[PDB]
Amino acid sequence: KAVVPFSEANKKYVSSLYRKSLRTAHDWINKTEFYRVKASEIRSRFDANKHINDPNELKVIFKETEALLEDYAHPDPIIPPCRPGGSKFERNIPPRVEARIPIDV
Amino acid sequence: KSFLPHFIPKNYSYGDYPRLKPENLQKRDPYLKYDDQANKRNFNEPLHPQQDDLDMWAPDHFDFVQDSIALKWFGTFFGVLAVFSSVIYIGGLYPEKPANPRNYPFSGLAKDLGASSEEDTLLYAAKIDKSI
Amino acid sequence: DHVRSPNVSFDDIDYNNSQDLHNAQESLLREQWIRVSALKVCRKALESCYKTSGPNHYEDCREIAEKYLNMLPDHRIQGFLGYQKNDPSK
Amino acid sequence: NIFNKWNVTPFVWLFATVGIFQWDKSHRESHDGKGILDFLGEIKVKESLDTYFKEYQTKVA
Amino acid sequence: MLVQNLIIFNIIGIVLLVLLNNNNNGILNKKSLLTIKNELKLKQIGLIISIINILIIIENWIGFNSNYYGFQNIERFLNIYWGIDGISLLLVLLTLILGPIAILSNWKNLKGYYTYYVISINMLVILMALNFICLDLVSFYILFESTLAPLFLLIGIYGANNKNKAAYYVLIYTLASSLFMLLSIVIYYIIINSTDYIYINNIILSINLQSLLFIGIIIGIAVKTPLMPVHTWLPTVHSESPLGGSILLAGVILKLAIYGVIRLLLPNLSEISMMFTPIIYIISILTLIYSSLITLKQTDLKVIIAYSSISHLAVCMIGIFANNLIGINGSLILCLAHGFVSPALFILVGGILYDRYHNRLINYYQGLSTFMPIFSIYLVVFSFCNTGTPLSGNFVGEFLSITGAVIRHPIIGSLTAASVLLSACYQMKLTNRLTGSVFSQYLHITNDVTNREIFLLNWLLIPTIIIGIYPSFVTNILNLASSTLIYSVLI
Amino acid sequence: AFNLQLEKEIRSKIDSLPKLNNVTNRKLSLTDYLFQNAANQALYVDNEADLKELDENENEGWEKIMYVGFVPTMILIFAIVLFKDDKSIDEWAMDELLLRLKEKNLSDVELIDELDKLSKSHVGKIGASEINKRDAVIIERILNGEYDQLSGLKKKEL
Amino acid sequence: IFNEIEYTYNIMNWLNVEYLVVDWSFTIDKLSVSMLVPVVTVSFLVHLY
Amino acid sequence: HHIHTPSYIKPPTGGWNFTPANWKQNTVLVLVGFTACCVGLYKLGEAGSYNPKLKYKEEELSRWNQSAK
């Protein structure tokens, strides 16, 4: 659809692209000192184009930003163990709380 | 990217059963709320005719690379070893034996390798030590 | 008790006498079950030798291994319908 | 209750079967190798069964 | 004694049950004592007759001699000569044992008319039990086809939503084909002037006429032991028939078709059985592979077990047509082992789940091992037995049948080994889904397996594991009987 | 013990509280199902059916039969396959193989010595087994020569 | 391993179909006991762990 | 915390940290059973086992190979 800059919904999209960018950097870079350096740059690359008042100019970046993430996506992203996709997700789920309705079989 | 698994049809018309584009239920966002959180499905949602092939119980689908690209990398990797094994075979670069193959006394232990008489012998004999 | 086999051949009887024909079928079945029993005994002799000989099992167990592989194809139950209904002489 | 209705039943079958098997093994020594169920009847012998077969085949023919 | 005691007592029992129930009909409305507790007294008398039928045969099992070759217990009743040999004795034992279990399975899950159901179940069991002990093709056919009259009514009266389709399937599939078996029986009566087993075993026919009679008879057999492509009746009937009708239709009726080979094809049509055995293997191997793959795409719970029945019976036919003792003994042990494991699954699938939730769709059931643990132990235990796990009686049957298949034909008979893998595909997928992940959001917590349903399971599992651990109980009876079926001349 | 008035107590105790959907000493006999007349049987229906009305899968009427009639039948089947004196064809063929050794080798003193000292119980385990018994002569004699007449039954050759 | 001894407990017969005879027989040769050290030893510590 | 529904769910292996009140008594009844059977298994193992390398002397085998010849 159309892209309306400075609208609340358009900002959240840019917020989402930011979590994709930094987490992907975190996935590849496994040293904090190296990560902050690259994480600082991405924000600069994210904040340099902060000011846009045009629809069509912004949509090209959205097209480009998706391509940047897809090619750089990690083949084994880090996931917290209890979050979905983690090593301990769904383990030992507490049983459902409900009354046993007896049936006369 | 986000491609659907093989053999899922592009079109179907089963009379009055609803038509709907296939959706790979394994790839729904695991954080969104669902009525059936394990199957990531909401109550009374319609099913594709082959929904059994597009849910959490079907074989896992991996979409990191295209199914053709995987063949190229897979065949190349063994193809690389093929040339490494071929060139040595074609070139004969493997070393020669440093000693004669081990020989054995008593007619190559013919009798001790399950032989009865001297006519067969070579059938059951080992490397004969002709140089006692 | 130990019933004696009715040693009887398909080549000496009239199949119209279904009492004698029954014995010719029962006698051909019982002899075959003896050959399997003979075979299972011979195989037991092979097993002791291999266990006892160890490395020499190829020598001390030579003719038993030869004989066992010779009796194997024919020391099996084959029924009587083959020989009752076929005439080898013709 | 460890000795409740369900746990015990396999052991009742387990111990009883061992006892009767040992009983039957003994009973063969003192009764000429004949088993514990020899009282229920006798195996049919060929001489008795052949008469039935011959009448059956004769009537058939 | 046997058949005479087996018919006269059952007829007396059937008359007794009818007299008790129908006395009060009259002109006035009746609220009698026999209707109280859902015809409970009349159901009990039906259950006792099933137990007594077993006692009749055991009275004659004691007299059985394992070292005598030939039919024993020969008697003439209704101008028909009966008798028992090694093979027939065990199948009779299986048929009568499923009597009490078929009745007990439907103890309190019918809307009414329990007396009619109890009479029909004991009637079907007797007709099938008597089918193993006759000694002519005509009497074989009479008992082979008489079971349609109660089974067609039973499935129609007591069936599921599609009972009319199921009733129209068993009646026509198993009659339009068995009528082809009547033609070959008739031709035996025209040229030989007798259909007795012994009389026709000693005759050789022209190799053209052998091919005609075989084609007629195997048409009637390929439907009862459903071989592709004429298997379409069994999945439908299973998914719609009453639970007790499924135990008999899978436990016994299929095994009447393997016994059909033993009496009607191997002894008298021995020369033409050798010719068709390559073709029989092709049909059965394709039945084994296709039925296993079709099961992977099914949704009804009770259909899924129905197709698993077809894959095992294809293996049984593979073994029995192997011309050796290994294949024949293995095929018969598998029929006995399948005779307990197959009914047990229908109890688990169409008798325990369906009596609580009344829906056979697979999508509603998952995580059942949480609030129904005793159910999931038996589903796991019976899943392995159904797939030839070495300690069960199915592995002994399948391994020997596969071994006998390779002996008969090393090249194509080796493809029977795909039974070990494919049987674990559709079955373990079904069990892994049922007892995996979180408990289903469409079901509601209820009772676990009741005490009656445990009794049914324990006494279908106990015979299965005895035959697995010590199969020589079956073998000591079979060996002299199964050795008369082998055709080979070695010179 | 039909106890016609015992129903009237159930009748009166229910009658005092006619409101519905809101004991142990009752047990019939075979006589009451058939001998009894309709009117006395007519009231019994209401008491029993509606006693449940005012409501764990136990005492369903089958446990008395299956546990007393069906289960002992299985023990009888299990007993028979265990302790029956049925001689299988192959077990017969093992005794027959040895009984021919005695008849075909009556001049052999040593062979008959092992057969004589042998017990009839250990016939089924000739060879390597837990039993401390000597059978080398028995096994050796069978190896040297055949003791079957399968060719003796076949008087026709190619 | 050191004393050159072998053990064989034969519970009973399993399959007795004509010539094919299979026992419930358990033996412990050099190789059987060479594998029972890695199996039972590790598994005991695994259970203790 | 959370509820085990232990009123009815009684699998043979307990369920969700199950421990009976009389667990000390039952274990000694069980520790006997393990001891009763381990002792019992040792008796049968000694009585029913054998050495398959000493049942037949080589002097007896040497006659077998020649007899089959």
Ligand SMILES: CCCCCCCCCCCCCCCCCC(=O)OC[C@H](COP(=O)(O)OCCN)OC(=O)CCCCCCCCCCCCCCCCC
């Ligand atoms: C929910 C399921 C409930 C049911 C589960 C049932 C599990 C019970 C396990 C046992 C299964 C039944 C097998 C035992 C009954 C048959 C015993 C038998 O046939 O023994 C025959 C054996 C040889 O026969 P013979 O020497 O001629 O003299 C015997 C005269 N009757 O005579 C003998 O001397 C044998 C003496 C007995 C030896 C011990 C038997 C132990 C059987 C259990 C272990 C089986 C082998 C190990 C399997 C475990 C995996 C390796």
Ligand SMILES: CCCCCCCCCCCC(=O)OC[C@H](COP(=O)(O)OCC[N+](C)(C)C)OC(=O)CCCCCCCCCCC
């Ligand atoms: C001391 C060392 C030996 C110990 C051996 C165990 C003895 C006690 C057994 C009785 C326990 C019992 O019966 O329970 C165990 C369970 C539970 O069933 P339940 O008890 O009826 O559940 C109670 C239900 N209520 C609430 C309705 C009353 O049974 C089963 O489902 C058994 C399933 C089969 C188990 C695996 C068999 C596979 C065979 C492999 C080996 C041949």
Ligand SMILES: CCCCCCCCCCCC(=O)OC[C@H](COP(=O)(O)OCC[N+](C)(C)C)OC(=O)CCCCCCCCCCC
């Ligand atoms: C061994 C073979 C013996 C021969 C048996 C012949 C069957 C005749 C029985 C008549 C009795 C009767 O009509 O009675 C009816 C009885 C019992 O009905 P109910 O539920 O008590 O009454 C119901 C009404 N109420 C509850 C309101 C009072 O049901 C039967 O008929 C069942 C058996 C026959 C069904 C199939 C017949 C197929 C015949 C062809 C088979 C080759």
Ligand SMILES: CCCCCCCCCCCC(=O)OC[C@H](COP(=O)(O)OCC[N+](C)(C)C)OC(=O)CCCCCCCCCCC
């Ligand atoms: C060589 C033959 C060996 C046989 C010996 C058998 C020992 C194992 C017995 C397990 C019984 C049990 O307890 O299984 C039942 C367990 C119990 O769950 P829990 O941990 O008690 O928690 C209880 C609370 N749940 C249930 C919510 C977690 O739940 C299940 O339904 C698991 C699925 C079925 C398991 C089937 C295993 C059967 C063993 C394999 C048979 C061949």
